[PDB]
Amino acid sequence: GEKTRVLVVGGTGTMGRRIVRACLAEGHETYVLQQPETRVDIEKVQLLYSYKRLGARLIEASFSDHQSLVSAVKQVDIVVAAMSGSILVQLKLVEAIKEAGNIKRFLPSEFGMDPSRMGDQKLEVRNAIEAAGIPHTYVVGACFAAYFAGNLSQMGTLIPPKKKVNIYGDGNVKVVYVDEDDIAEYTAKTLDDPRTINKTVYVRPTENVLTQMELVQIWEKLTGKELEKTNISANDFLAQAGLGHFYHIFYEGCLTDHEVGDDEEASKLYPDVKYTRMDEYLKIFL
Amino acid sequence: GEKTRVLVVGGTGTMGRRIVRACLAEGHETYVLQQPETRVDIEKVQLLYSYKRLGARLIEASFSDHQSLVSAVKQVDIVVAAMSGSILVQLKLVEAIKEAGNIKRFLPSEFGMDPSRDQKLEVRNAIEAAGIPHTYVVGACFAAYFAGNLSQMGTLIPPKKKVNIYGDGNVKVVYVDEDDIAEYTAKTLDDPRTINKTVYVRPTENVLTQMELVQIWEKLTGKELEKTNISANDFLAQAGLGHFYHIFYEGCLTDHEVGDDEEASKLYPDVKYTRMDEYLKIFL
Numbered sequence: 356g357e358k359t360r361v362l363v364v365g366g367t368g369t370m371g372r373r374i375v376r377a378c379l380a381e382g383h384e385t386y387v388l389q390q391p392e393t394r395v396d397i398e399k400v401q402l403l404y405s406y407k408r409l410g411a412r413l414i415e416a417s418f419s420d421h422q423s424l425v426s427a428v429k430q431v432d433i434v435v436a437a438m439s440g441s442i443l444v445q446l447k448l449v450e451a452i453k454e455a456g457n458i459k460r461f462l463p464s465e466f467g468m469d470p471s472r473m474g475d476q477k478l479e480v481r482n483a484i485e486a487a488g489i490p491h492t493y494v495v496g497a498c499f500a501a502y503f504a505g506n507l508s509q510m511g512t513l514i515p516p517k518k519k520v521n522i523y524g525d526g527n528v529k530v531v532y533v534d535e536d537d538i539a540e541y542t543a544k545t546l547d548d549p550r551t552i553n554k555t556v557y558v559r560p561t562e563n564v565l566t567q568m569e570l571v572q573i574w575e576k577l578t579g580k581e582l583e584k585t586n587i588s589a590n591d592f593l594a595q596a597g598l599g600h601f602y603h604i605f606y607e608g609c610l611t612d613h614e615v616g617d618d619e620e621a622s623k624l625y626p627d628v629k630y631t632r633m634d635e636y637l638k639i640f641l
Numbered sequence: 642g643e644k645t646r647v648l649v650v651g652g653t654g655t656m657g658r659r660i661v662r663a664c665l666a667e668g669h670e671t672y673v674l675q676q677p678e679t680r681v682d683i684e685k686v687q688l689l690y691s692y693k694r695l696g697a698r699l700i701e702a703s704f705s706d707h708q709s710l711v712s713a714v715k716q717v718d719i720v721v722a723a724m725s726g727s728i729l730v731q732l733k734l735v736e737a738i739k740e741a742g743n744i745k746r747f748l749p750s751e752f753g754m755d756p757s758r759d760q761k762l763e764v765r766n767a768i769e770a771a772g773i774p775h776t777y778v779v780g781a782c783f784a785a786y787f788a789g790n791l792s793q794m795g796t797l798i799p800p801k802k803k804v805n806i807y808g809d810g811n812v813k814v815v816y817v818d819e820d821d822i823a824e825y826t827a828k829t830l831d832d833p834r835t836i837n838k839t840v841y842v843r844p845t846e847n848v849l850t851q852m853e854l855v856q857i858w859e860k861l862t863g864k865e866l867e868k869t870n871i872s873a874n875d876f877l878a879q880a881g882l883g884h885f886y887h888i889f890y891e892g893c894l895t896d897h898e899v900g901d902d903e904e905a906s907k908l909y910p911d912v913k914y915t916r917m918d919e920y921l922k923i924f925l
């Protein structure tokens with residue numbers, strides 16, 4: 356009745372699935388976009404339909420069909436998108452929101468490095484949102500803990516090393532490690548918060564701002580074993596998949612080289628979210 | 642303490658993940674084989690580690706490393722395999738079980754058509770050559786692959802206006818929720834009555850023709866679907882076609898009756914299996 360109605364686009368994605376449940380947890384009437392099947396994909400289908408059992412609704416639409424996008428967004432108050440990074444497909448979604456005219460806010464697929472400090476398709480999407488006058492919130496500023504914490508920031512894996520661990524530089528650059536659930540919960544709390552309309556929200560829970568060497572030492576403290584570390588210089592690091600992102604995060608320190616005010620930081624805006632600290636996050640791997 | 646210890650091989654698969662949960666839900670001390678990551682795969686890793694929260698344990702081993710397989714299966718009493726249907730990777734698992742010597746039962750990756758009427762039969766023969774006690778769980782169509790799409794190909798959800806009927810669609814088929822298959826598997830793996838037996842998962846009310854399946858749906862929706870009957874030869878004129886043919890034209894799942902002592906729903910009458918009118922409700 357007084358629920359905010361939210362449409363989640365990219366609902367079976369890594370972040371999308373968590374945003375779906377977090378909107379439900381917060382009591383929003385939650386709608387998930389159901390795209391036509393491109394394959395026989397049991398996992399995707401069963402995930403989408405498990406949302407119905409939790410109280411969500413599915414709306415079939417296709418980005419190839421402008422009027423199906425328009426009809427979907429007319430049923431909701433707020434749209435959140437979490438596409439792969441696929442980003443530019445949101446342009447069709449923005450066009451639909453503009454025509455529909457009823458959307459109180461649009462959260463596009465961000466949830467990572469703020470692209471507007473990396474001087475790119477996310478900015479192209481931002482520019483379209485703002486040219487159309489669609490109220491927005493941009494959620495940025497955090498490494499997914501699954502991609503950067505559980506592996507102690509090693510590449511090619513998602514679990515803790517047995518023995519050996521590479522340290523980028525001296526491992527003294529501060530990075531922001533956040534459990535994707537908490538990013539999704541922050542997103543669900545912020546999407547109808549009058550304080551964040553037309554703002555960028557930084558997800559930087561204070562106790563989770565850690566250097567890589569700090570994260571490794573949380574883990575060494577849990578296992579009681581010191582890992583053999585070898586440090587990698589910037590030049591040697593600079594000597595395909597994702598190596599750039601890693602450089603900005605761990606050498607340039609792009610996630611922590613600016614300060615953020617409490618009126619734009621998720622953990623201060625939403626203090627009741629007991630976000631997962633990395634000593635608790637890493638326990639699953641013991 | 643008195644619990645059966647079970648190693649699930651294939652724990653992150655469609656059937657395997659349900660067997661993991663169904664084993665924990667039975668009270669089995671449950672182990673899951675953790676294979677080396679072949680890629681950055683976040684849904685697979687997180688599924689694996691979610692099992693620990695429910696009480697399961699992870700055992701690392703690799704099929705390339707015979708001794709790591711022997712080491713894994715020494716830690717359990719029973720192994721259940723649910724590999725991709727790869728099936729032959731189980732031959733390494735059989736040699737490992739044979740050398741280990743401690744395993745009371747092995748349930749190989751079956752969960753469908755009876756291959757004894759094939760890679761699966763080769764696994765069977767190696768299991769039996771090695772004298773490893775076994776149970777073969779067979780005889781049903783996964784409901785997600787065959788019921789939710791009304792047995793249409795290339796989709797997993799109901800069609801909106803038209804549907805292909807195979808023949809006249811009056812060949813009987815066995816549609817079963819994968820969770821029920823997993824529950825029957827978890828109940829049967831330490832059941833004395835099914836040692837060295839085939840167990841047929843043929844819940845009585847879910848033995849249905851494709852047309853009876855379609856009519857279940859039309860009745861839930863109140864909408865009649867436009868039907869096109871496809872004859873045997875026009876079908877004998879793409880993955881999975883041989884399977885649909887044996888299921889839907891020859892009735893290979895239902896042409897032989899099965900005794901109560903070997904049919905899952907009678908062995909375990911406490912399993913309130915999902916009937917297809919309830920299964921299809923989630924699509925409405």
Ligand SMILES: NC(=O)C1=CN([C@@H]2O[C@H](COP(=O)(O)OP(=O)(O)OC[C@H]3O[C@@H](n4cnc5c(N)ncnc54)[C@H](OP(=O)(O)O)[C@@H]3O)[C@@H](O)[C@H]2O)C=CC1
Binds near residue numbers: 366438444467468500
């Ligand atoms: N450390 C960090 O901060 C991280 C940041 N991110 C960012 O989070 C956001 C989501 O990333 P992630 O959660 O990993 O996304 P995914 O790879 O999980 O895919 C998400 C959804 O994208 C939809 N999708 C993919 N291609 C298309 C397409 N051509 N047309 C329509 N829909 C498509 C699908 O929606 P559907 O479910 O409907 O099929 C897919 O389910 C991204 O912006 C990413 O840049 C993610 C990784 C780490």
Ligand SMILES: NC(=O)C1=CN([C@@H]2O[C@H](COP(=O)(O)OP(=O)(O)OC[C@H]3O[C@@H](n4cnc5c(N)ncnc54)[C@H](OP(=O)(O)O)[C@@H]3O)[C@@H](O)[C@H]2O)C=CC1
Binds near residue numbers: 653676723727782
């Ligand atoms: N309608 C029916 O009756 C159905 C019957 N089946 C049968 O179910 C059984 C399982 O099918 P399904 O659930 O679809 O299996 P999956 O496709 O989901 O994969 C299961 C597991 O196979 C392991 N795997 C795949 N390749 C390898 C490999 N080279 N080496 C080691 N492990 C590998 C992986 O285990 P891991 O988690 O460790 O990574 C994978 O998780 C099969 O026998 C299949 O015939 C399946 C579909 C329908």
Ligand SMILES: COc1cc([C@H]2OC[C@H]3[C@@H]2CO[C@@H]3c2ccc(O)c(OC)c2)ccc1O
Binds near residue numbers: 600
């Ligand atoms: C932190 O913000 C982001 C990070 C990322 C990616 O940075 C590289 C990481 C993460 C997604 O997964 C990338 C990755 C790529 C290759 C890898 O080997 C890897 O670690 C296994 C991780 C993408 C978008 C973002 O907004």
Ligand SMILES: COc1cc([C@H]2OC[C@H]3[C@@H]2CO[C@@H]3c2ccc(O)c(OC)c2)ccc1O
Binds near residue numbers: 797
């Ligand atoms: C029913 O027994 C089995 C069925 C199957 C597969 O037969 C074809 C079916 C099912 C798995 O999904 C296959 C399938 C293949 C192509 C399709 O287009 C399809 O659409 C649902 C479904 C494999 C192993 C079995 O033991």
